[PDB]
Write an enzyme that holds these catalytic residues in place. Structure first.
Site, PDB file in Angstrom:
ATOM      1  CE1 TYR A   1     -25.622  29.464  40.816  1.00 46.14           C
ATOM      2  CE2 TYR A   1     -25.057  30.340  38.946  1.00 46.14           C
ATOM      3  CZ  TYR A   1     -25.278  29.745  40.299  1.00 46.14           C
ATOM      4  OH  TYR A   1     -26.141  28.652  39.134  1.00 46.14           O
ATOM      5  CG  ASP A   2     -24.430  28.284  45.776  1.00 44.22           C
ATOM      6  OD1 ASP A   2     -25.318  28.503  45.247  1.00 44.22           O
ATOM      7  OD2 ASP A   2     -24.030  26.584  44.895  1.00 44.22           O
TER       8      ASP A   2
ATOM      9  CG  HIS B   1     -18.674  33.785  37.251  1.00 40.55           C
ATOM     10  ND1 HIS B   1     -18.578  34.425  36.433  1.00 40.55           N
ATOM     11  CD2 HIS B   1     -18.341  32.340  37.181  1.00 40.55           C
ATOM     12  CE1 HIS B   1     -17.965  34.020  35.168  1.00 40.55           C
ATOM     13  NE2 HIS B   1     -17.546  32.849  35.618  1.00 40.55           N
TER      14      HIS B   1
END
EC number: 3.2.2.5
Lengths: 645, 111, 647
Positions: free
Chosen positions: C113-114, C148
Site C-alpha cells: 500500500y505504498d 490492497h
C-alpha cells in the site's frame, strides 16, 4: 487513405466512398457567406483549421489548381547553424516544457551530450500527463538516440583515437558511462509505442515510424525513377519530398538528423538529381541543337541546396560529383545568403580556435561541414570583405591536424578562380608568409600530403601580381646571417619576392660549384638565367659521360636545349647514348622507330604545346592515333585532342 | 600479396604498399623507405617545364633532402602486411617500364 | 549450479523475452527501503489501548484482531490519524525496484500500500489500479495492480485492507480486482518475490489454485530469501502444491541479517542470464541452431544477407559464402558447428537424434551456399541455378502442370503462381482465395501469409490494368475489354475494402512473428532497401576508378553486385512470389546489369597487363551466359539497350 495529398499542395480523392468533407471544407474556405452559416464554436474551429492548413501548405484541390509554385522555408536555428544564438537561448530560463525540449535538442546539436541526456530525463520525469504525451514519446526516442550516439563515440574514441587524434581525450567521465549503461541495461524501443495509452495510439499513429530502426526505405527505393533513360516531373517530386523530410526532421527537433542513414539518403538523392540534369542537358544538345537549348542546365542551385551539400557530403563525394556532373555550367542562386553562411562558418572557426575551448565531441561534427563548405565555395562569387574574412580564418585559425599546408593551398587556389586577388588578400597571404618565415627560426620542418609547400603561395602572388615586393621579408633577410641554414633555404624558395638589395645580400650565402650544385639550385632555388660558365659545367658533365660510354640526368638538359634555355652547338656532339636526348636535340634525323609514346605522359602543358608547334608533329600524331586505336586510353586521347588538334 | 596491387595508367605507375631497403649510390645505405608521387598539370612554373608529376622520398616517416639522386642498387623489398620478400617481382616490374619510378605507395591526383 | 535452478532461470528468461512475465511483489522489498512495518503499528495500537505492550504474545490472528478492536472501541478518526502519523513519511527507492523493472515485466501485482514501486516507475508507463472504479477507466494495457488499496485517494483506513473485517469481506468488497488478478495469474507467468512461505496471501492463492485442474495452469515461481537454507521435506511439500521454489540462501553465502545482497544475487543472476545462451557442449549447439533454423525448412531458398536477421545480429553472413563474428559474446556456436562439419571423428560424440539434426542442418547450409568461416575460406567457387519453370519461360510445361491434378497445397501454390504468370489473373485470384480458405488446418502458416500477400499484389495488378485499359482508349484490341466482368471487379472491390497490408504481419500468431521474422519485409519495399543502397555506393566507387584510368589486378568489386543480384532473383523466383512483376525490381536488375556490362567493357581493353604482369596472373573475364541473356531480355527496354549499345 481517403485522400492523396500531393507534394505540390493539391488534394485528390483516392478511396473516399462517403461524403467529400475536404471538398466542402475548401468550398467554405473560398467563400465568405457560406463560411458564416456556422455557429461560433464551429467558426473558431474553422479558423484554427484554416490557420493550420495554410501553415502546412495545403493549397486547394487538383481541379482548382492555380499558379502553383512552391518554395521551401525552414524556421529552425539549428539548420542555419547560428551557434551563438542557440548558445544564448540555452542560458535563458524556460517557461514551458516545449522550451525545455528545444533546449535539449540545441544542447545535443552543440555537442553537450551529457547535459542533453540529463535534460531529456528531466523532461521525461516532469511530463507524464495528460494530453502532451507526444512530448513524452519524443523525449524517450531522443534519449535513446543520444545513448546510441554516446556509445558509438566511445567506441571510436577509445580506439582509432587517443594520440592519433592528439590526446587520450576521454569525452565523458567513467561515472557517467557506468550510469548510462545501468539506466539502459535492457531498454527496448520496439515496444515503446505499444505501451502508450490507447488514445495516444489512436491519435498519434503517424509517429510510429519514429520507433523503427529504418524509416527511409521508401524514398531510397523511389530514387530509381531518376535513372530512367527513356525519352510534375520526377525531379521536382524528388526534390520536394526531400525538402519535406528535412523540414519535418529539423522543425520538430529530432536527433535522427545526425545518423549515417540520413546522410547517405541525402547524398544519394542530390547526386542522382545532378546526374539526371546533366544527362538531360547532354541529350538535348545531341538532338535539338548545339546551343538552341542554351547549354544552361535546368538545375538551379539555391541556398538550401548549398547548405545540404556542405553538411551531408564528404570531400571524396564532392570530388566524384564534380568529376561526373560538371558543375561550372550549374549557376548558383542566392549569393548574399550563401556569403553570410560562409562568413558565419569562418567566425565560428575563429572562435573555436582562439578561445581554446575546443569541444572534442562537437569538433568532429563541425570540422567536416567547415571543410566541405570551404571546398564548395569556389563556384560562389564573394564580396571583398567576406572573402577577406574567409581567407583569414582558413589560413590562420584552421587547425593544422585537419588541413596541412598543401591542402590549405589547394583550398586557397580554388577560392581565387571566380574572384581573383584584390590587394587585401595579397596582404593577408604576405602576412601568412611572414609568420611562417618567423616560425622557421630549431628542429622544425613543414609537413604536407600533396607535395605543395610555402613556395607555391609566393608563386601564386607573383602570378597575380608581377611587381610585388615583401618589405617585411626583405627586413627579415637583411638581418639574416650564415648560422641558420634552414632560414636561408626557405628564403631561397621565396627568392623572387625579395627586393634587389635583399637578393644581392642573400646570394652571398650559397654558390654553385659542380653539376650537382647547378641541378639542385635550379631544382629548388631560382637560377633561371643560364650563364655561359654553368653551360661549360654541363658540357664537362656531358664530355665525362661521353668518354665513360642509371637515373635521369641527360634528358633534362636535352629538354632545356629544345626549349631554348641553352644555346650552343656543342650539344650536337653528344648524340647516340640516350635516345630521348637525340629526339629533343635532333628531331629531323631522329629514328622514330625508337620513340615510345609513354614519354608524352611526363610533359606539362607548355612543353606539349611547344612540341605541337614544331615540325615532328606528324610522327607524334601517328603514334598517338595508333595508341588510341589499339587501347582506349583516356590520357592519350585527351592530349591528342587538346594539343595536336 | 598481389591482390592489392594497382596500376595507374595516367602517369604509368604502380601502387603497391611495400618498403624499399634502397642503397644510395656510393655506398650510402638506406633503411625501409618509400616514394610518393603527385600528379599536377596546372602548377605555376618557370624553367622547370619538364614535369607533371612530383616525386618525394619518405624515409623513417620523414622527407629525405635530395642532393644527388642516382640510387640504382635496387632494394630488399618487404611487404609490410606480413613481411614478405617481393624483390624479384619489383625488379621485373621495373625493367618492364621505362618510367623513372615504377613503384610508389600513394598517388595524389591534383587535377 | 543445480540443474533445476538452471531450468527455472531458462524458463523465466524465455518468458521475459516473449513478454509474458508478471512480477508479484511482497513486503520485504518495501522493507529493504526501511519503510515502517505493520508490527510497529500493532505495537502502537496496543500501547494506546492497553497501556503496555507484550512482545511474547503476538500471533498471526492477533496482528489482525488488535487493529479491529482499536477501530471498534476508539472509533474511526483515531485510526486515520495514527495511519497518517506513521505512514506520511517519504523514503527513497530501492535498487531491487530498478532490477525488477529492468526485467521488462508485462504486469506488476503488489500487495503493498505504498508508492515506492510507483515512484521507481525510470520512464515506464503503467496504469495504476488501486480501487474499483479504476478497473474500467484503465488507459493502457499494462496494469500496476495494487491489490490492497493504495493511499493515493487519502490516508483513511477505508481505502486500504488492514484489519480483520476487511480481510473477511475482501471477496464481496473487491470482486473486479480479485477476478482481474486471478485472470492475470492464470494467463501469464508469475514470479513471487519478498514473500514468506507462511504468508497469508500465498496460502489463499494456493487454496484457490487447488480447485483448478491438473493441466490447465502453469506452476508459478517463488524466490525465497530467508537466512536458513530450505529443508527437503518443506521444499517437496510446497512443490507438490504447485510452486517451483528458487532458494537464495543456497546461491550465495551470507550472515543472518543480510537481506539486500541476498535478493541482489538472484536478481543479478536473472538479469545477466538474459543475454547468456546456456550452451557448453556440442549437443546444445546443435539443438539451438536447429531450433533457430528449422522453421525455414518450408522455404526453398533463403538469401544469405537476411540470415543476420535470423541470428539477431550475432554473425555477418556475406554473399561470397563466408561467416564473420560481429557481436557474439557466447561460445561461438557457428565456429563449433563448422569444426564439427570439417571433422567426422567428433560426429560420433552426439546422440542419434542430434546426429540426424546435424545432418539436416548440414544439408540445409550446403543448399544455400554457406561454406565456412572467413579466414579458413580458400578458393570458394560458386555456381548459379534457378529451378523454376516460370523463370525459363517454358509455357507449355506450366500449362500441362496446371491441367494435371494437384494432390497437396504446395502444388496449388505453384499452380496459382503459374496462372498469375500466364495472365489468367481471375483464376489465379480464385485459386489463391481457395488456398487461404483451405489453410485453416496447418503446422507452419507460411503458405497462408504468402498467399494473402500474393492475392493483394494481384489485386493491385488488376486495378492498374483496368485503369490503363480504359484510359488508353481502346486503341489496342477491339473494345479493350479485359476478362474483368464488372461483377468480378465489384466482388474484388467489396472483398478488399478493409484489407490493410501494414497490419497483416502484426495480426499473425506470436510463434509466426518469432520464427518467420525475415518474411516481414515482403509486405513493403524494405526488402529491396539493403541491396539498393549498397548498389548506389558501389556505382559511385566503380566509376570513380574509370575516371582515373586505374586498373585493379585482383578481385573486382562487381562480384558483390552479381552475387546479390542472383540471390535476389533466386529467392523471388523459387518461392513463387508475385513481387517479380514490380517496376522497382525491374529497375534494380536493369541498373545492376548495366553496371556489370560497363565494368566488363572497361576492363576488356587494358593497357599494360599483357606487357608485363600477364606472366603472373590474368583473371579478367566476363562471360555472358544463358542467365545473363534471360535477365537482359526480361528486365530491359529497347531504349536502355540502345543506350548500352551506344556506350
Amino acid at each position: 487513405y481517403d485522400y492523396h495529398f500531393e507534394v505540390n499542395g493539391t488534394v485528390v480523392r483516392h478511396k473516399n466512398k462517403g461524403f467529400g468533407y475536404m471538398e466542402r471544407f475548401f468550398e467554405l474556405k473560398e467563400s465568405c457567406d457560406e463560411r458564416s452559416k456556422l455557429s461560433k464554436k464551429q467558426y473558431e474551429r474553422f479558423n484554427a483549421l484554416f490557420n493550420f492548413f495554410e501553415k502546412n501548405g495545403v493549397i486547394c484541390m487538383a481541379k482548382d489548381a492555380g499558379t502553383l509554385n512552391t518554395s521551401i522555408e525552414i524556421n529552425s536555428l539549428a539548420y542555419h547553424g547560428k551557434y551563438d544564438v542557440m548558445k544564448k537561448f540555452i542560458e535563458e530560463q524556460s517557461v514551458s516544457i516545449e522550451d525545455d525540449y528545444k533546449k535539449a535538442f540545441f544542447l545535443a546539436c552543440l555537442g553537450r551530450w551529457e547535459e542533453s541526456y540529463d535534460l531529456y530525463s528531466n523532461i521525461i520525469l516532469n511530463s507524464i500527463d495528460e494530453s502532451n504525451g507526444c512530448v513524452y514519446y519524443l523525449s524517450q526516442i531522443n534519449r535513446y538516440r543520444i545513448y546510441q550516439s554516446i556509445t558509438q563515440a566511445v567506441t571510436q574514441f577509445n580506439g582509432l583515437g587517443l594520440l592519433t587524434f592528439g590526446r587520450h581525450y576521454k569525452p565523458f567521465t567513467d561515472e557517467f558511462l557506468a550510469r548510462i549503461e545501468r539506466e539502459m541495461t535492457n531498454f527496448n524501443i520496439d515496444d515503446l509505442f505499444n505501451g502508450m495509452p490507447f488514445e495516444f495510439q489512436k491519435k498519434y499513429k503517424i509517429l510510429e515510424f519514429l520507433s523503427d530502426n529504418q524509416f527511409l526505405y521508401d524514398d531510397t527505393v523511389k530514387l530509381f525513377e531518376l535513372t530512367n533513360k527513356v525519352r510534375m516531373s520526377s525531379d521536382i517530386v524528388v526534390l520536394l519530398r526531400l525538402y519535406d523530410n528535412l523540414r519535418f526532421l529539423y522543425e520538430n527537433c529530432l536527433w535522427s538528423v545526425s545518423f549515417h542513414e540520413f546522410h547517405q539518403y541525402i547524398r544519394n538523392s542530390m547526386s542522382l538529381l545532378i546526374e539526371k540534369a546533366e544527362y538531360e542537358r547532354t541529350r538535348d544538345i545531341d538532338e535539338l541543337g548545339f546551343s538552341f537549348f542554351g547549354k544552361k542546365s535546368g538545375f538551379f542551385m539555391e541556398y538550401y541546396d548549398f547548405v545540404n551539400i556542405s553538411r551531408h557530403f564528404k570531400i571524396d563525394d564532392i570530388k566524384n560529383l564534380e568529376r561526373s556532373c560538371s558543375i561550372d555550367k550549374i549557376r548558383f542562386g542566392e549569393q548574399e545568403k550563401i556569403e553570410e553562411y560562409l562568413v558565419g562558418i569562418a567566425e565560428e572557426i575563429t572562435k573555436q580556435f582562439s578561445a581554446n575551448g575546443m569541444n572534442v565531441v562537437f569538433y568532429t561534427q563541425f570540422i567536416s561541414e567547415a571543410k566541405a563548405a570551404l571546398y564548395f565555395a569556389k563556384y560562389v562569387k564573394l564580396s571583398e570583405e567576406g572573402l577577406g574574412k574567409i581567407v583569414k580564418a582558413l589560413l590562420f585559425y584552421f587547425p593544422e591536424r585537419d588541413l596541412d599546408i598543401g591542402k590549405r593551398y589547394v583550398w586557397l587556389e580554388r577560392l581565387t578562380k571566380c574572384n581573383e586577388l584584390p590587394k587585401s588578400i595579397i596582404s593577408i597571404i604576405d602576412d601568412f608568409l611572414v609568420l611562417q618565415a618567423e616560425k622557421h627560426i630549431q628542429n622544425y620542418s613543414e609537413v604536407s600530403s600533396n607535395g605543395l609547400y610555402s613556395r607555391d603561395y609566393g608563386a601564386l602572388i607573383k602570378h597575380f601580381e608581377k611587381n610585388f615586393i615583401s618589405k617585411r621579408l626583405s627586413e627579415i633577410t637583411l638581418c639574416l646571417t650564415q648560422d641558420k641554414q634552414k632560414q636561408i633555404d626557405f628564403l631561397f624558395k621565396l627568392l623572387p619576392l625579395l627586393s634587389t638589395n635583399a637578393k644581392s645580400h642573400l646570394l652571398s650565402f650559397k654558390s654553385v660549384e659542380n653539376i650537382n650544385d647547378l641541378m639542385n639550385g635550379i631544382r629548388i632555388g631560382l637560377i633561371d638565367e643560364f650563364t655561359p660558365e654553368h653551360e661549360e659545367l654541363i658540357i664537362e658533365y656531358l664530355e665525362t659521360r661521353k668518354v665513360n660510354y642509371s637515373n635521369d640526368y641527360m634528358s633534362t638538359f636535352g629538354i632545356w636545349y629544345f626549349l631554348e634555355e641553352i644555346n650552343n652547338s656543342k650539344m650536337e656532339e653528344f648524340i647516340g647514348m640516350d635516345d630521348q636526348y637525340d629526339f629533343f636535340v635532333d628531331p629531323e634525323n631522329f629514328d622514330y622507330k625508337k620513340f615510345i609514346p609513354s614519354w608524352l605522359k611526363n610533359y606539362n602543358d607548355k612543353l606539349l604545346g611547344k612540341i605541337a608547334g614544331n615540325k615532328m608533329k606528324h610522327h607524334v600524331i601517328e603514334v598517338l592515333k595508333e595508341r588510341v586505336k589499339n587501347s582506349n586510353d583516356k590520357r592519350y586521347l585527351e592530349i591528342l585532342m587538346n594539343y595536336f588538334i | 600479396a598481389t591482390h592489392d596491387l594497382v596500376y595507374h595508367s595516367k602517369i604509368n605507375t604502380f601502387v603497391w604498399d611495400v618498403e624499399f631497403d634502397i642503397v644510395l649510390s656510393d655506398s650510402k645505405e638506406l633503411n625501409k623507405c618509400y616514394f610518393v608521387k603527385c600528379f599536377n598539370p596546372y602548377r605555376i612554373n618557370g624553367k622547370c617545364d619538364f614535369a607533371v608529376s612530383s616525386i618525394d622520398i619518405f624515409s623513417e616517416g620523414k622527407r629525405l633532402l635530395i642532393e644527388n639522386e642516382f640510387n640504382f642498387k635496387i632494394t630488399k623489398a618487404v611487404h609490410v602486411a606480413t613481411s614478405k620478400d617481393v624483390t624479384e617481382i619489383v625488379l621485373h616490374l621495373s625493367e618492364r617500364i621505362s618510367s623513372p619510378f615504377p613503384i610508389v605507395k600513394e598517388v595524389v591526383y591534383l587535377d | 549450479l543445480d540443474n533445476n535452478v538452471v531450468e527455472c532461470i531458462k524458463e523465466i528468461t524465455e518468458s521475459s523475452r516473449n513478454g509474458k512475465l508478471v512480477f508479484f511483489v511482497g513486503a520485504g522489498v518495501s522493507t529493504l527501503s526501511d519503510y515502517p512495518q505493520w508490527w510497529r503499528l500493532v505495537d502502537k495500537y496496543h500501547e494506546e489501548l492497553y497501556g503496555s505492550p507484550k512482545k511474547g504474545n503476538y500471533s498471526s490472528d492477533e496482528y489482525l484482531r488488535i487493529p479491529q478492536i482499536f477501530y471498534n472501541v476508539k472509533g474511526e478518526m483515531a485510526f486515520d490519524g495514527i495511519l497518517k502519523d506513521f505512514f506520511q513519511v517519504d523514503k527513497p527507492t530501492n535498487p531491487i525496484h530498478d532490477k525488477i523493472l529492468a526485467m521488462n515485466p508485462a504486469h506488476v501485482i503488489t500487495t503493498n500500500y505504498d508508492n515506492l514501486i510507483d515512484t521507481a516507475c525510470r520512464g515506464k508507463y503503467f496504469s495504476v489500479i488501486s480501487a474499483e472504479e479504476d478497473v474500467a477507466n484503465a488507459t493502457s494495457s499494462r496494469y500496476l495492480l495494487k491489490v490492497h488499496g493504495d493511499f493515493r485517494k487519502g490516508f483513511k483506513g477505508e481505502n486500504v485492507v488492514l484489519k480483520e473485517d476487511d480481510y473477511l469481506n475482501y471477496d464481496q468488497n473487491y470482486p473486479l480486482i480479485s477476478n482481474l488478478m486471478k485472470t492475470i495469474i492464470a494467463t501469464h507467468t508469475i514470479v513471487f518475490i519478498g514473500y514468506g512461505l507462511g504468508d497469508y496471501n500465498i496460502n489463499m492463492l494456493l487454496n484457490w489454485v487447488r480447485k483448478l485442474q491438473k493441466d490447465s495452469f502453469h506452476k508459478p515461481f517463488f524466490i525465497r530469501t530467508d537466512p536458513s537454507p530450505i529443508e527437503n521435506e518443506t521444499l517437496i511439500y510446497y512443490e507438490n502444491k504447485g510452486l517451483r521454489i528458487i532458494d537464495a540462501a543456497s546461491l550465495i553465502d551470507s550472515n543472518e541479517y543480510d537481506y539486500l545482497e541476498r535478493y541482489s544475487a538472484v536478481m543479478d543472476l536473472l538479469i545477466e542470464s538474459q543475454e547468456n545462451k546456456f550452451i557448453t557442449k556440442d549437443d546444445e549447439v546443435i539443438d539451438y541452431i536447429y531450433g533457430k533454423i528449422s522453421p525455414l525448412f518450408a522455404l526453398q531458398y533463403i538469401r544469405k544477407i537476411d540470415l543476420k536477421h535470423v541470428f539477431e545480429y550475432d554473425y555477418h553472413f556475406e554473399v561470397n559464402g563466408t561467416v564473420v563474428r560481429h557481436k557474439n559474446k557466447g561460445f561461438g556456436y557457428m565456429e563449433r558447428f563448422f569444426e564439427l562439419k570439417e571433422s567426422c571423428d567428433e560426429r560420433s560424440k552426439l546422440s542419434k537424434k542430434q546426429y540426424e539434426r546435424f545432418n539436416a542442418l548440414f544439408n540445409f547450409f550446403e543448399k544455400n551456399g554457406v561454406i565456412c568461416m572467413a579466414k579458413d575460406a580458400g578458393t570458394l567457387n560458386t555456381s548459379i541455378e534457378i529451378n523454376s519453370l516460370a523463370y525459363h519461360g517454358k509455357y507449355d510445361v506450366m500449362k500441362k502442370f496446371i491441367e494435371e491434378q494437384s494432390v497437396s497445397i504446395e502444388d496449388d501454390y505453384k499452380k496459382a503462381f503459374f496462372l498469375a504468370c500466364l495472365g489468367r489473373w481471375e483464376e489465379s485470384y480464385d485459386l489463391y482465395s481457395n488456398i487461404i480458405l483451405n489453410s485453416i488446418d496447418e503446422s507452419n502458416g507460411c503458405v497462408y501469409y504468402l498467399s494473402q500477400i500474393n492475392r493483394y499484389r494481384i489485386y493491385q495488378s488488376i486495378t492498374q490494368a483496368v485503369t490503363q485499359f480504359n484510359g488508353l482508349g481502346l486503341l489496342t484490341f477491339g473494345r479493350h475489354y479485359k476478362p474483368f466482368t464488372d461483377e468480378f471487379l465489384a466482388r474484388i472491390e467489396r472483398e478488399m475494402t478493409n484489407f490493410n497490408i501494414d497490419d497483416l504481419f502484426n495480426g499473425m500468431p506470436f510463434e509466426f512473428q518469432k520464427k518467420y521474422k525475415i518474411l516481414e519485409f515482403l509486405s513493403d519495399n524494405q526488402f529491396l532497401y539493403d541491396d539498393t543502397v549498397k548498389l548506389f555506393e558501389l556505382t559511385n566507387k566503380v566509376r570513380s576508378e574509370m575516371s582515373e584510368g586505374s586498373y585493379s589486378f585482383g578481385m573486382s568489386s562487381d562480384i558483390v553486385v552479381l552475387l546479390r543480384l542472383y540471390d535476389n532473383l533466386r529467392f523471388l523466383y523459387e518461392n513463387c512470389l508475385w513481387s517479380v512483376s514490380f517496376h522497382e525490381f525491374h529497375q534494380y536488375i536493369r541498373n545492376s546489369m548495366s553496371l556489370l556490362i560497363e565494368k566488363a567493357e572497361y576492363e576488356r581493353t587494358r593497357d599494360i597487363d599483357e606487357l608485363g604482369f600477364s606472366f603472373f596472373g590474368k583473371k579478367s573475364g566476363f562471360f555472358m551466359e544463358y542467365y545473363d541473356f534471360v535477365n537482359i531480355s526480361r528486365h530491359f527496354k529497347i531504349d536502355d539497350i540502345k543506350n548500352l549499345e551506344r556506350s
